[PDB]
Design a protein around this nucleic acid. Structure first.
Ligand SMILES: [Mg+2]
Ligand SMILES: [Mg+2]
Ligand SMILES: [Mg+2]
Ligand SMILES: [Mg+2]
Ligand SMILES: [Mg+2]
Ligand SMILES: [Mg+2]
Ligand SMILES: [Mg+2]
Ligand SMILES: [Mg+2]
Lengths: 93, 240
RNA sequence: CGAGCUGGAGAUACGCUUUGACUCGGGGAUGUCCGAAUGGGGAAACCCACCUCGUAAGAGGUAUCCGCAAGGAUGGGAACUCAGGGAACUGAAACAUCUCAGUACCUGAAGGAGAAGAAAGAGAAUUCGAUUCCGUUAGUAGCGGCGAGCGAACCCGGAU
RNA sequence: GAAACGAUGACUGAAUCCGCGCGGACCACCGCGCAAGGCUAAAUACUCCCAGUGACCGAUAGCGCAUAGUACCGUGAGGG
RNA sequence: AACGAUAAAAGAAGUGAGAAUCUUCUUCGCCGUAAGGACAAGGGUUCCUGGGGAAGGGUCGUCCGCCCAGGGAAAGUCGGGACCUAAGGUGAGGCCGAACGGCGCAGCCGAUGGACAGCAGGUCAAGAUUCCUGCACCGAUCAUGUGGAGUGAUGGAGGGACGCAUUACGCUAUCCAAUGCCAAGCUAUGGCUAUGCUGGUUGGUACGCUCAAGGGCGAUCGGGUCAGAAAAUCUACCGGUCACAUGCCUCAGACGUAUCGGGAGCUUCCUCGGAAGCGAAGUUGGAAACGCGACGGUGCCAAGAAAAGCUUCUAAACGUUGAAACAUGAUUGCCCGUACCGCAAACCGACACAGGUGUCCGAGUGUCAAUGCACUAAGGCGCGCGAGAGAACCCUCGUUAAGGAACUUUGCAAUCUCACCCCGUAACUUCGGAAGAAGGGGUCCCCACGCUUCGCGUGGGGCGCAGUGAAUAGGCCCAGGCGACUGUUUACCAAAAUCACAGCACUCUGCCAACACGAACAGUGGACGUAUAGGGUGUGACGCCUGCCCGGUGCCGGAA
């Protein structure tokens, strides 16, 4: 449904500097598509998406204990909105 | 040069080299040739041009029928561009006409002869091959085949007037290995140059030979390889 | 069950529990995608569809072989079972019939077992009374380049 | 083999109870039995798994592993 | 013993417990058709930042491709898919087979090929034809108008659609020159005072009575059904009418105006160094692609994929009262790939290994040419032990008196020779050759004169031991054996006189061919071939030739 799909917001410094331009970035379901992802943001936040660019991302740590390691596997979606920008207030984090 | 098919190389059957040797070649295309001609009975055609044909030895003639259907036929020795050609029982003893043997006069020279009414031409197809007619028997006609063999072919089967084209494969002296390569792979590899494992002429100390046989078992200079078949009754006088 | 619990975890934070947590015994309900794999494709876990219901989400269907249809079959099982097919090293102090051995292996079908089973029999008492298994007969009878070697069954005792 | 009897790939091909098959070529007599339709539990076998036990082991032993079919090796089957 | 190419390294400054090795500055040296740069494969976070400093790193590390954490990867248009087919794979029905299975028409899968819409810039610490700014394009659904009637398949046709060599004209990327323009300053060692020196010198898009080589083309009417299953207004064929040059159609590219961009550098701030703001010029002449015009021209034999998209036809169907096509608005824009290494310390090689790895770009000067050779831009690097010493011996080199093969199995090795131009050149010959035969001469600089240049010829003059002044750079000849020739071979001790070869012969094979693979009355190769063809066996260009023996063996033939 709506509320699932978007797992978490992209933290970092580049997303926070993108925030300032009305560009919001999210960690989404890897299986989720552009249409499906655009819908969920448009709905849950009540804002029109004028553009969506998205791409898949791998994993692979370990620290100690010869426990092989393992990937983690995400997907990052970045959206642009028309002049009527902003998300909640959950932008000035 | 006009509406043909793609002839793809292949010398092995189900996986294995089955016809020894065979490889190189200039990648040729297949031209469909009307070997039967029966369905174009009565209709006259004009010789549009005599084209080159790899896959053959016999030059190819492009027939332009009155009904506008274009077909290819083995060009006979003599046929010129701008001549007429007719198929069916109604036909003169003129070059390139397709007419069954009963209508064919005795002593006449023919090519592209059938064997069973239909199927298509099966005898004397390669350049300069001729079939001398000897004279009728019943439904069957006694004919002289390019080998010298005399066969009983029933008059119900078509033939084309004259000897095959591409005059003579003589001034064609190949020249060098590699001319042979424009066609078939490193030819005849002597079994005498082989090893005992590989072939019966294998081994020994130097240049030799001892019992004369092919690749697999058999014997090679003289051995009747023809079987005890039914097609034998429709055949009189073979050798040479 | 009756006070502890928050998996191994040796780890802090948030909490849950006598309106009975936790754990244990017994049912249900959810069970992504792959795999017989089954909509179609495919280099398993990914691509791409159509049809029905629907407010979108979402749900159901779309493989071939049996049969009217209900309903059955595909695939997986350590070893055991029967079947189709079936070695050689080896023994014979060589080797060829013979032995190894219908062993090993492949393949098929199936089950908790299967196989076999209800005398056109065993057999020499005008006894017996479906089958399998165990003891025994017995290394007897016999088979055998009568060599290496191979080897029963009936009677009787017993499980059922 | 004197080789009966079962079994069947090829060719043939009967009787019907004063009838058919068997009894180790074969004959007669004496005796045993009814093929060419189907099912049928129990006793038997094995051990992935579970419990109990032991003149079984106790870390180079015991399963390959006090756990791992991992690390490592190999294109792969496989090996470990 | 070794520390993995003999491409060097030096000093200063910094940091730190600690410094030959880490950072920074100034030099030096090596590559520069690469030792630079861009993919692909393959690898998998190796990328960037901040930390670390066990082990890995052939030494040492404060550092790293190692260790820890955080971040980074952005697509309607680029690759792939939702499109197409090749080899091959599979394959309902079907054809075979103890089983397991083997074949196989359509169809389907399958890129290494076909098809198809976007360019110029900017800049994170790390992405960019993906984000952003500017201005484009493609298709789909709907809306508003133009428009006024067809639309046109699962089938037809056209078309996609294809070789090798060689080559004419035009151009571009791109490169050179200058007392062209623009910008910055200063130079002094003896001089120059700029006509010196350094650097920059035009990319996209829109429009334009501007120039333009080249490149592509017939239009119509009719007839025959016997052709495209049928139909066709489409296509083929035959006939008639205008088919010389031309005539239409297309503009590679140039020029001009505009506009967005970029541009040497300058300007301020500076948290040890980056960010921000601004912006000049745009000349003339020369060269020039393997790219573009383009499916050009010619020659040649060995005769050069398919299928979809597309363009044109009718069939059926709905509709002729709301058609197709155009135009302008909005909406829409799925999935996978994108970091980094990628001739290498990130891939294959057990290693941070002197090997191996497909494609593209690859500047300048000199030198007939060149991707050669020397030096050198841009860019990258000094090869992860170091420092002394200056023995024997061993490796790789330079020179060498007199002699010159005496060495030795053997001139093995190593010299000599060496490029371009001119003269000159044998036996022998298959009249091509042999031939670069052999041999001899020239080669640099300046001036004057001539011409066909980038340059050349003639004259005179100059300097050195020497003028392809350094690098790249045939030693030649006489006679023989063997094999005619180019070619092929023993991955890893044999490259040859081996094998192959063009040519010759014997021979078998009449087509469900012989022959071959196979469980098989399957299937397939031979072959979509047909005796001027195919199998086998031998000899091995060309020239003159190939004798004697048919008892034994084999093959073909007869049969009392
Ligand atoms: Mg111990
Ligand atoms: Mg285990
Ligand atoms: Mg096929
Ligand atoms: Mg030293
Ligand atoms: Mg000293
Ligand atoms: Mg001699
Ligand atoms: Mg030779
Ligand atoms: Mg050679």
């Amino acid at each position: 449904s709506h509320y699932d799909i978007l797992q978490a917001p992209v933290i970092s410094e580049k997303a926070y500097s993108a925030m300032e331009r009305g560009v919001y970035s999210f960690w989404v379901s890897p299986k989720a598509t552009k249409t499906e992802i655009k819908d969920a943001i448009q709905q849950a936040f009540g804002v029109r998406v004028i553009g969506i660019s998205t791409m898949n991302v791998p994993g692979k740590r370990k620290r100690v204990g010869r426990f092989i390691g393992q990937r983690n596997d995400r997907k990052k979606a970045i959206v642009r909105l028309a002049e009527g920008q902003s998300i909640e207030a959950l932008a000035g984090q | 040069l006009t509406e043909a098919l793609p002839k793809t190389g292949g010398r092995n059957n189900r996986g294995r080299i089955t016809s020894r040797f065979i490889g190189g070649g200039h990648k040729r295309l297949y031209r469909i040739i009307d070997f039967k001609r029966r369905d174009k009975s009565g209709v006259n055609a004009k010789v549009a041009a005599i084209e080159y044909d790899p896959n053959r030895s016999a030059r190819i003639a492009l027939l332009h029928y009155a009904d506008g259907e274009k077909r290819y036929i083995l060009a006979p020795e003599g046929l010129t561009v701008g001549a007429t050609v007719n198929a069916g029982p109604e036909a003169e003893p003129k070059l390139g006409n397709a007419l069954p043997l009963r209508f064919v006069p005795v002593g006449a020279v023919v090519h592209a002869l059938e064997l069973v009414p239909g199927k298509g031409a099966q005898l004397a197809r390669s350049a300069g091959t001729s079939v001398q007619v000897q004279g009728k028997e019943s439904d069957y006609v006694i004919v002289r085949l390019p080998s010298g063999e005399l066969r009983r072919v029933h008059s119900e089967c078509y033939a084309t007037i004259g000897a095959v084209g591409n005059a003579e494969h003589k001034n064609i002296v190949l020249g060098k290995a590699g001319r042979s390569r424009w066609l078939g792979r490193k030819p005849h590899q002597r079994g005498s140059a082989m090893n005992p494992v590989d072939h019966p002429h294998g081994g020994g100390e130097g240049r030799t030979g001892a019992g004369r046989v092919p690749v697999t078992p058999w014997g090679k200079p003289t051995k009747g390889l023809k079987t005890r078949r039914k097609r034998k009754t429709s055949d009189r006088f073979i050798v040479t």
